[PDB]
Symmetry: D3
Subunit: 295 residues, 6 copies
């Protein structure tokens, strides 16, 4: 019922292994978005001119990773210098409606926060329609450098390390964490503790601004996509604490701790990756339409 053009794409297992990884995954995500959109809206056809025109089919085989549920719907087609994909309508008999690429709903089991799949998210929204030492560590005022904490990573605490850039690290890794906690029992995340060793590695004091980064944490947490089922639709309840990290003499850095309360309904990390084809192009459906269509 729809054409969709990926454009210039390189086909072939060996050829894609030997191609610039960034462009490889760019092309791949274009194909995955197109297949998701065609799946969710009706039947469709994808087209893309082959870049390496001296490499022909039967040198490609299965390649450029195709999700297994999606693979059952598409069908490969090769015509002259162009490549086509026949996308059947998304089956509704696999108890889950509308093909979603990534739920962006995270939840933490034992020691791992993990993004829910289609089924896990389905049962999750279905469910939502109807420790002491950790608190002590959060209440602490002054950590020592290379201090080994005795609080172990669990469903309520997550030790994560800083990257080279503090702001980018917390802005990138925080949404996953606060989503996972809010959706499952809540808990604490500590930035600057090394998970495998549970030692305190504060980020250098010269490489952090506390008030500015706190405003950044507030912005990032408020910008989180939220969907409610209840009457009194509240906000995410978080509290930020900067723990001081000294070593010998005087202050060295900070460990950046965020406590996230369990959340009544459901919270996303980013707008869920699911796609429509509206009028003329692939357009990812927004949060309301996604969670309502999942119902």
């Amino acid at each position: 019922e729809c054409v969709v053009d990926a454009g210039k794409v390189t086909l072939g297992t060996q050829q894609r292994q030997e191609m610039d990884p960034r462009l490889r995954e760019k092309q791949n995500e274009i194909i995955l978005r197109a297949v998701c959109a065609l799946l969710n809206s009706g039947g469709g056809i994808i087209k893309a001119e082959i870049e390496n025109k001296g490499y022909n089919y039967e040198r490609h085989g299965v390649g450029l990773d195709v999700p297994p549920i999606f693979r059952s719907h598409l069908d490969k087609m090769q015509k002259e210098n162009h490549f086509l994909i026949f996308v059947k309508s998304w089956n509704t008999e696999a108890g889950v409606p509308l093909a979603t690429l990534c739920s962006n709903l995270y939840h933490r089991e034992r020691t791992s926060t993990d993004v829910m799949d289609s089924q896990e998210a389905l049962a999750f929204l279905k469910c939502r329609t109807q420790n002491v030492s950790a608190a002590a560590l959060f209440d602490r005022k002054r950590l020592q450098y290379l201090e080994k904490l005795n609080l172990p990573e669990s469903t309520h605490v997550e030790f994560v390390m800083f990257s080279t850039d503090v702001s980018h690290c917390v802005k990138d890794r925080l949404p996953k964490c606060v989503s996972a906690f809010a959706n499952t029992e809540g808990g604490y995340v500590f930035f600057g503790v090394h998970d495998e060793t549970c030692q305190v590695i504060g980020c250098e004091k010269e490489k952090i601004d506390l008030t500015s980064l706190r405003a950044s944490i507030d912005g990032c947490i408020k910008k989180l996509p939220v969907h409610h089922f209840c009457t009194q639709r509240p906000e995410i309840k978080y509290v930020l604490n900067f723990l001081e990290v000294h070593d010998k003499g005087a202050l060295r850095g900070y460990v950046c701790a965020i406590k996230v309360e369990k959340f009544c309904c459901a919270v996303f990390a980013k707008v869920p990756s699911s796609w429509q084809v509206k009028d003329n192009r692939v357009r990812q459906l927004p949060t309301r339409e996604w969670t309502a269509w999942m119902m």
Copy 2:
């Protein structure tokens, strides 16, 4: 030049090994006090009726418990039911004048506080007539239970454990420490840290009163025997800090830290154990007379 009576004493190696150790050491200390007293003054004779009357001579303790320098000066005598000791005058030819039983002057080298001998104390008084991480630990406010400190025992810090009784433990062990520090570079002593492991244990909060124990520390520290050679003649400079020791939730106990500044002259732990015969009686000479006689 003097009689001196030890009284009822049990003689014999086997017989004293098989006797109540407390009474054994009582008798022994009486004999040593008598031998010191006779030694520093004119020669003398000690007498004591043997308790174990089935004792034969030459079955004694060659040095029952007598410093070797003393053994060379005395001479044993056995007559009927009594035992006598011929005490020659203390030889001034050893370079040491008074013949002291224990200097009670302590000093800390590397990892050990140690009481100076006669020679070491002599050269010490002769000399007196002519770290950052430790400070950080002292300035700290809140220790965690079983925290392993990275500050190691040294010439400036001494980790000592509490006994069952806090007041008796600190009142008994503190004078040695503050003397040793005052005489050599000063330093810190911490009560409630286990030396071999450098972990924080601390005395239980229910078994300590802070203001009362601090008054006790001040009283005990003022009471230390001090001798000056200098002009102004100052007092010992100490600072007491009670470090809180929490575990999980909330406060569990305290670590009792004392910082002791290096001292101008010399500081004793107790009045030096050296003995005179004045009005034909054993009488330990006081601190002033001791340090003056040492010259």
Copy 3:
């Protein structure tokens, strides 16, 4: 079908937050006992004169399942609670306040709720290194054990009072082990660090405390389903804890075998209304009423 008087009670969220916690939880627990008792036997009404008589409603610690059954009423200086009969439709019969049935999953001993206890009794009607640590005899002070807390071993610390600590914390442990795979509990090991901190030798009598644990363990409420009805099989070992070649204290270890049926810590907190007052039904009546 029954009157019941709580008496002098202070009402109000802010006012109870600003009230002595001891008396607050006394009052609260009286209300919980009364609502449980009326809940189990018919319908009833609770009345209690308000203490802070200048504070009225909209100017408490109540379980959510109970909340659906009661209805608050304010009349002059007295406060009333309308207690409906316990709804047998939540697959669980008779409202129980606390099962006092413990079981240890993974690293935590936990008291079973009404449902968990129900399914548990229904099921009951139809490691090597740990044993090595128990068989030992001489631990060193601040020795870090390599045996980790699990469904079979529980490291618990001593309190300031040894007798009170073991006498208070032991029933929970032996119940939890008896109900799930059994296991060992060690007193004097610090759980978060797995180090040995024996209680001081001057503050413990071994034979007397052994008699005390024996009494506490035998007096534990037990209910049987089988033909032969034996007692709980426990073994006590006092591990010596030395430091610098000198006995310092003891670590007090108790091994508890897995138990055929069910073992309680205390008589289960569930309440009746008899012609006189609220009266907690005994163990037999509770375990029979659950079925």
Copy 4:
């Protein structure tokens, strides 16, 4: 025999405690340099107008952070708005010739590298006129992040931490170390290991250039002041190794190790801080003149 002007200086214990610390120690170092120069050359007088002119003497304080040996030579004087210091000639009878401010000759005894004082440097130059696990750690190729090394800090190994700036940290902290090793048994210094815990941290890989920093280490070590007593006056024998520091997937940083051989004679960190008065101004004597003047 000489005037010397410190200029605008703030006098007073309380007043200097309440003054900008940087300007405080700038002024202080001017006074110390002047007193050193006057001491070494002959007799002299220092003058400086007081800044806080309402804070006069008996507040100016005996405290000015001045080495005690120097205090015995100077004598303070207060006149109107100016302050003077009478500097006697340096007393040679304390077995040490010429007043030195800082020898800049380092040596590592047991667990501490330390700058020698006048006496220690004297006896040191006088003496100069007449481990396996450490080598294993140096030969290693890839340490793991937060690895606890079993090699302990000793007279032969020194664990030092990185600062925020790697280049500045090694360029500032290395001369002390290589001097201390060169003067006493030699040894290894490791950058990126935490001394109190003997754990491996290392500077982040994004904040270091390997070849450029190696050239920087070569320049800094060659630039070191050296004085010889022997026949064949050789150079410092050093070797630099970058240990890789991985964590989980892949490398995070490097630990920067320098091995320094024991040195025949003496090696400095910087030109020794000792001062002359050359006709019109204070002028710190160079290395040659200092080490030669120390011998007499």
Copy 5:
């Protein structure tokens, strides 16, 4: 329907506790094999002359290693100097067909590799008819002696110690591990690391040949029984790495690591312990017949 002779066996709880354990477990295994065979084929009787012919007569007990499911089928009989066991045909009402003594199918949950029971193996084969730090540890090259690894034992890594004999230790313990991994998510096993402490010990270099042991593990890994249900029937995918273990100076030993991929179907450690009586002799059915009869 069948006789079966165990032969000379000692009966009696006290008497077997007081008998040579080797012969005791030999006899016991003969009885278990016979009862398994009679169970699997059709009702039969076991016979065995008592060794201690004056010690048996209701002074035996229910004691003796007999699985309870089996015991519900047996019936003991005592006649003069001989002992008989009446074995009913295997129930089959327990949802599980054929009495199996040991599945020899292993699977690793959490921290334990474990042999599946009859039911677990049944549901497992039924299901089969229809980490980063670990990989980092495997990719390494040079471990230090007594190094504490931060990778913890999990469903994917198994730390096992060497015995006194390296070849016998790995040849005996490897099949269990590779089976358990092949049946559940796969994973790594490390030989020479102490599980309770996660330290590196490794077998001494003088007590190992790398190429010979690599051929040995390859042989042992190929020799293990495998059964397939799928179309293409591949082999188990394993990779062996010898990690060098130095201490101070130079090489001390090796840690022997094996990575085992998750396997399509089911993998055994040995031919499954289940027994038939063919003709008139006890004969353990082979792997194919066992897995097929399980249905």
Copy 6:
């Protein structure tokens, strides 16, 4: 005034670096023995045919520097000669000794005394609680980290592949070092850098036989006395059991050595004479007497 023949020697710095190290040190130690003997007895000359006969002079090697001041090298055709002056008594040490074999423990290292240290030592001889606790323990756990640190009184040493050879080789140094300085304890099976317990496998040790072996090795130790009463060295051996999980895995082999009145050697001191035939190392009596 004595000839001495080293024999076939391969000469040359590059050539000796490129030669079999075993034969290298064989030859070298022969030269050192000859130089020691000639030094101690009088003047002498050493002769040795060069092996690599195309590698001559203009193409120094392993000799103590004090010896170097006495020797003088000479190259003549296919033979090489060494002029050995009589050992100068003008240095503080009489006689030239190659190795005192008298050990003493300073701090964390046991060390063989040099000529001067041994001289002052014998001259001087002519006129802790946690360690004792560890010795008494009898039962260690595998990979237990001991809190007793290596010091002048305790020495942690590891086992080799062969237990008997390891203890028989490393024990004399230790017991000598302790006997000469404060005494102390040595533990076999503890890893020094980590202070963990690594017991030797139980299958690879016989307790009574090895105890007889250590007794023999300790009695065979060279001893020299200065005092009136001349007793033997007082040692006590304890085998500490090392369990892991389940049951016994191995043993840690502990030896306590009391401080000794006089001096104790590890082996007969390496010092050499020239008798009418060859180099002949003087025995212990002659060495310690000659030092006086």
